Amino acid sequence: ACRDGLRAQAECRNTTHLLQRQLTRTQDSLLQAETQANSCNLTVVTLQESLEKKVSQALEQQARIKELENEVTKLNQELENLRIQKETSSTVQVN
Amino acid sequence: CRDGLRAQAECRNTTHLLQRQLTRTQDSLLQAETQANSCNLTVVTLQESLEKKVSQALEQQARIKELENEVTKLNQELENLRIQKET
């Protein structure tokens, strides 16, 4: 009889009911994932900020190392010059 | 019956709309998870680059201190030798 109809209507009502709950739960999971992505992005920006500072600082240090190397070379040459002056202090032309 | 045929066609249209919304939301969910996973990789990449740059800055600071010590040393040697000469 119309028993078949009542059963079909119940099935459809149950299915829509279930789908609504699944939809709400999936949307909630979506928003949770988006919340995680947002937080992660701030972490990325913070790391990028710190890396920029360190990259600049490393370059500054390399310039300073170069400056100091040049000074050590200069002072070593001055010491070497004094040693050579002593080495040659008795050297004359004899021919 | 007809009381059921109408109620059924409607409930069918609603089922389909909800199934469509669910699919869309699931797909957006997967995309958001991928954004989070990609971001996680970027974090690891940056953490490792930052660790190397921090370590480089430490090595370079050690070198700077060594060189500064050498400069002071040589400067004093030169001053002692210069005072000694013709005093």
Please spell the DSSP secondary structure of A1-51, one letter per residue: -THHHHHHHHHHHHHHHHHHHHHHHHHHHHHHHHHHHHHHHHHHHHHHHHH
**Enclosing H/E stretch for B24:** helix B3-84
Please report the number of interchain residue pairs, chain A to chain B, with beta-carbon separation below 8 angstroms.
120
Angstrom distances, CA of residue B34 to CA of A30, A33, B64, B87:
11, 9, 45, 79
Interface-testing mutation among B24, B48, B53, with chain A (most A C-beta atoms within 10 A): B53
Q: What is the CATH number of domain B1-87?
A: 1.20.5.1700
For this PDB entry, the determination method is X-ray
Q: Is there a contact between B81 and A76 if contact means CB atoms under 8 Å apart? A: no
What was the resolution (in A) of this experimentally determined structure? Answer: 1.6
CATH architecture of A1-95: Up-down Bundle (1.20)
Domain chopping of chain B, boundaries: 1-87
Min distance B84 CA to chain A CA atoms (Å):
12
* Euclidean distance between CA atoms A13 and B20, whole angstroms: 17
Among positive and negative, which fits the CA dihedral A15, A20, A22, A26?
A: positive
End-to-end, the C-alpha distance of chain B in Å comes to 128
* Euclidean distance between CA atoms A68 and A48, whole angstroms: 30
* Euclidean distance between CA atoms A74 and A80, whole angstroms: 10
